């Protein structure tokens, strides 16, 4: 028995899916200090006395601080918050920072190279260690304190019985020397939990409720865990609390006054309905979910007006399958082309959804209204750089001609073209994949600028081009029926039709605003006039 | 003793119901059950909204409801002091009693409530606002450490109010510190009715308000009015009906004989509506009085067809859901009246929100300023239930001059994008 | 700081002067009894 305590469950304490983190922690440090000192000196070396844990806000860092102290078989830790070690009277701050490394010096003199490790916990290690020459109008307390701590931890005076652990949200304000090898080296990051870890996080927090049989058997942990993606431990705790709260309120009543329901809450069991509602309107992630896009680009589903709405899907599926299981070609691209008002931006989201790639995103101009060319380039580069951190991906650039800022007088356009024409050949880092699908409405222009020989294939999206297809589309939409469809069929036969499928959901609506006796005539007149010719 | 009516805050029933559900629900059954669950009570509230919607009344009423010790108050930046290390000392002061009581009873403490006003004055983004000193990048860290972290606290409730929700530090909004983030919005007609009813109760109880006045007309005519605006209208109407008995001459006078027959009339309401109170949201009738200067005459049938087509289009953009967005373009020769047949259609629609984005209010702007103004006028139209917007004289927005040709590209691109961007669901 | 410092200096001055004068007075009187006692 040197340091490790007997109980090493690490699930009894409360920590979740952090197995690898602590294994790496021990492999890199806290290992030599439980080994033959003879061998230690035989190789001859010193120990390591620093770690900095930097993770996104609310990611279990604070809990690790109060739980590492418990598992260590030693005196105790001390937590000193950053904004506390300043005092009004001159000189007090230096004295206070000095006291934190005293009993370790005394033990190195009275028990030189003997005794245990000292643990000092610096919480909010960003509050005090900012810089040395970045302030102004501020006596000098900050610089003096940082200098004192830096010299004390590292300097001529030698210390060997201490371990400093600092914790912070934003590591981009920490001072330089501290991150420089020697004082707080061997940094570590705590990321978001994974799918498996979410199950353990849920289990740890839901044990007490299940102990007393207050949780309905209908609820399933695995369903919720798969449903909730891009969540933090705080968010999961919030979800559980909000479900409990919606039941909490389901029992109480009275808005004029407030009273309990005569202790009628014998079991107040929580059912999956409460979890669903809470996950819907109470808890929302910080990362953000691609749901509004997915349910706003496909606004009316994908009806079937013939064969030209199946071939495209089959070809997209083939391209996805190829990118999934090939090694000679890591990158594959494709272009969708067709006349305007033909449903291309809803035949490219569907193909993306059918494939279940972990990382899907859609970059469209609506998020860059009023941006100069530089900002557009920066945003697109950021999207791709994010896409470069997964074992699969699929990025969709829609309405290309509106990204290049095209207007056919001269003509005139924008850097964006070069960025887009270089980004489309860069292969990703070894052992990964990618797939780019583009949407456009003017093939010839893209041919002119020497962009159509950079894409690997092009598929054609046509529009209704025969009466029978128009009748079938009307039948499946289900607006005109009975004798009305009969007369429309009699009138339409011949002369063909050249109406796009987004222009057939506006004509029907403009037609259904008259009295019932004149609807058919108005629809036919609008089709005849606007229908135009190929 | 308590009653939802007594507090006198009308038009926010859903808001209060939600706050009660998620902030004061775990504190009402016998401790047994709540203890058996091992759940930590929520500690934090953040309220935001455009000025005049009623934020400081909700905090006051919540404070006055609880049968606890009186709440504290911090009027914005009242905790900054010169001597280094005193702001942190002061902010650390507000939690002493709660700490001591938690140590003393334990799991049986009485709520300590802290009410912050203008939370945006002190707690701002770290790294920015860096002009000098650093006493602003330290108070935030002290607050973050205090609210949660070392030590266990379960007997506090912090309430914050602000009108700029895009500057607060992100760390101070993760579930655990400030979890409930509700939103106060402008009232709808029923809310206006409730407000007008509440603010006039004490007068009808003393037969001081003539029966002539009708509340429904006042509610209907008032458009885009907020609570402050309604209170101001009532106050101004009182004052105008109230000045009559005074005799504003040398040696100020007042009549003590006729004063007992003081009465308030709907005409005074109208006078105050058209003289002294003017809302911000919407367009005031003075706007429509400046585009149809000389009415609408009938020179033939081609002045009737246009109006009928306008009626058809407005009706379709209210009762059909396959198409949430519509558009139309009025074209003709110059000097023919295509800005007084486009304001009379918008006026006769009775939509809640109506605006006009003309080119004469942005004389001399560059491209980016015009883009920003257009973006703002369109964004304010995404936060209602159904709205109409008028873009008159397009060819001047994007400067056109036949020589060249020359024009602006950024504005044209902004327009071509903004005519295909569907608004949020159901609007 | 100013008010307390002024209070301190004033009181210190007056007390010190009183003690000094009294000590000198006792010093001067002791010799008379000494000589009479001879």
């Amino acid at each position: 028995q040197s340091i490790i305590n007997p109980d090493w469950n690490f699930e009894k304490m409360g920590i979740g899916g952090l197995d690898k983190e602590f294994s790496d922690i021990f492999r890199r440090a806290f290992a030599s200090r439980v080994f033959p000192p003879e061998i230690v000196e035989q190789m001859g070396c010193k120990h390591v006395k620093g770690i900095l844990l930097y993770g996104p806000p609310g990611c279990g860092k604070t809990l690790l601080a109060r739980q590492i102290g418990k598992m260590l078989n030693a005196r105790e830790p001390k937590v000193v918050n950053g904004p506390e070690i300043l005092n009004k009277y001159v000189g007090e701050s230096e004295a206070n920072i000095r006291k934190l490394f005293a009993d370790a010096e005394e033990e190195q003199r009275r028990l030189g190279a003997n005794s245990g490790l000292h643990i000092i916990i610096f919480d909010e290690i960003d509050a005090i260690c900012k810089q040395r020459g970045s302030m102004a109008g501020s006596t000098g307390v900050h610089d003096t304190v940082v200098n004192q701590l830096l010299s004390k931890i590292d300097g001529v005076e030698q210390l060997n019985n201490i371990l400093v652990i600092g914790m912070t949200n934003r590591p981009d304000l920490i001072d330089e020397a501290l991150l420089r090898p020697g004082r707080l080296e061997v940094k570590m990051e705590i990321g978001l939990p994974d799918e498996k870890g979410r199950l353990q996080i849920l289990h740890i927090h839901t044990a007490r409720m299940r102990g007393h049989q207050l949780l309905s058997a209908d609820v399933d942990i695995k369903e919720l865990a798969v449903e909730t993606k891009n969540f933090s431990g705080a968010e999961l705790e919030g979800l559980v609390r909000a479900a409990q709260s919606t039941a909490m309120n389901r029992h109480i009543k009275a808005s004029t006054k407030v009273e309990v329901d005569m202790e009628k809450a014998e079991s107040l069991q929580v059912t999956r309905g409460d979890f669903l509602a809470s996950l819907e309107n109470d808890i929302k992630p910080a990362f953000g979910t691609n749901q509004e896009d997915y349910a706003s680009y496909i606004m009316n589903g994908i009806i079937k007006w013939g064969d030209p709405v199946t071939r495209v899907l089959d070809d997209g599926e083939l391209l996805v399958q190829q990118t999934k299981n090939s090694d000679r070609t890591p990158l594959v691209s494709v272009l969708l082309e067709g006349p305007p008002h033909s449903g291309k931006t809803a035949l490219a989201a569907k193909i993306a959804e059918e494939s279940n790639f972990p990382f899907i995103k859609i970059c469209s101009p609506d998020k860059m209204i009023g941006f100069s060319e530089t900002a557009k380039c920066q945003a697109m580069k950021k999207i791709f750089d994010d896409a470069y951190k997964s074992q699969l991906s699929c990025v969709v650039v829609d309405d290309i001609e509106r990204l290049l800022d095209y207007v056919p007088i001269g003509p005139r356009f924008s850097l964006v073209l070069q960025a887009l024409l270089v980004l489309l050949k860069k292969a990703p880092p070894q052992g990964r994949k990618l797939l780019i699908i583009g949407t456009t409405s003017r093939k010839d222009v893209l041919q002119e600028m020497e962009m159509l020989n950079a894409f690997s294939t092009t598929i054609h999206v046509p529009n209704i081009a025969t009466g029978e297809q128009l009748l079938e589309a009307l039948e499946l939409l289900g607006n005109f029926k009975d004798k009305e469809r009969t007369t429309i069929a009699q009138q339409v036969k011949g002369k063909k039709v050249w109406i796009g499928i987004k222009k057939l959901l506006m004509l029907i609506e403009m037609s259904l605003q008259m009295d019932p006796e004149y609807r058919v005539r108005k629809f036919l007149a609008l089709l005849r006039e606007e229908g135009a010719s190929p | 003793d308590w009653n939802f009516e007594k507090m006198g805050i009308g038009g926010l029933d859903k808001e209060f119901s939600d706050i009660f559900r998620r902030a004061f629900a775990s504190r009402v059954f016998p401790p047994e059950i709540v203890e058996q669950m091992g759940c930590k009570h929520v500690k934090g509230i953040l309220l935001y909204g455009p000025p005049g919607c009623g934020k400081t009344l909700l905090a006051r009423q919540i404070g006055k409801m609880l049968n606890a010790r009186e709440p504290k108050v911090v009027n914005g930046p009242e905790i900054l002091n010169k001597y280094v290390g005193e702001s942190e000392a002061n902010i650390r002061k507000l939690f002493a009693d709660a700490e001591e009581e938690q140590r003393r009873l334990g799991a049986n403490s009485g709520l300590h409530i802290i009410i912050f006003d203008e939370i945006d004055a002190i707690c701002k983004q770290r790294g920015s606002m860096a002009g000098s000193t650093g006493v602003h990048d330290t108070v935030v860290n002290q607050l973050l450490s205090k609210i949660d972290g070392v030590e266990q606290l379960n007997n506090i409730l912090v309430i914050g109010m602000t009108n700029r929700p895009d500057l607060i530090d992100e760390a101070l909004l993760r579930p655990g510190r400030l979890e409930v983030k509700m939103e106060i919005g402008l009232p709808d007609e029923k809310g206006r009715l409730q407000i007008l009813h509440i603010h006039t109760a004490r007068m009808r109880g003393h037969q001081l308000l003539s029966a002539d006045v009708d509340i429904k007309e006042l509610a209907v005519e008032t458009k885009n009015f907020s609570g402050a605006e309604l209170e101001g209208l009532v106050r101004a109407a009182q004052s105008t009906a109230m000045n009559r008995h005074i005799k504003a001459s040398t040696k100020v006078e007042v009549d003590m004989e006729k004063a007992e027959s003081l009465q308030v009339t709907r005409g005074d309401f109208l006078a105050s509506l058209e003289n002294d109170i003017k809302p911000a949201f919407g367009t005031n009738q003075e706007d429509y009085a400046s585009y149809i200067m000389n009415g609408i005459i009938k020179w033939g049938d081609p002045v009737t067809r246009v109006l009928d087509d306008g009626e058809l289009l407005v009706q379709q953009t209210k009762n059909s859901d396959r198409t949430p967005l519509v558009s139309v373009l009025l074209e003709g020769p110059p000097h023919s009246g295509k800005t007084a047949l486009a304001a009379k259609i918008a006026e006769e629609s009775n939509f809640p929100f109506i605006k006009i984005c003309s080119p004469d209010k942005m004389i001399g702007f560059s491209e980016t300023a015009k883009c920003q103004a257009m973006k703002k006028i369109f964004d304010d139209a995404y936060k209602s239930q159904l709205s109409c917007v008028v873009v008159d004289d397009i060819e001047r927005l994007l400067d056109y001059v036949p020589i060249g040709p020359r024009f602006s590209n950024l504005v044209l691109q902004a327009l071509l994008v903004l005519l295909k961007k569907a608004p949020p669901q159901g609007r | 700081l100013a008010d307390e410092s002024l209070e301190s200096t004033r009181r210190m001055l007056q007390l010190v002067e009183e003690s000094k004068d009294a000590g000198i007075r006792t010093l001067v009187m002791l010799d008379e009894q000494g000589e009479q006692l001879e």
Partner: peptide, 29 residues
């Protein structure tokens, strides 16, 4: 733009007093 201005803070030193009064008064008495 070149015009950059600044705010500032101050400190103190403090001394010892509280019971010296008792000693001085006792001596005088």
């Amino acid at each position: 733009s070149i015009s950059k201005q600044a705010l500032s803070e101050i400190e103190t030193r403090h001394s010892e007093i509280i019971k010296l009064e008792n000693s001085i008064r006792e001596l005088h008495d």
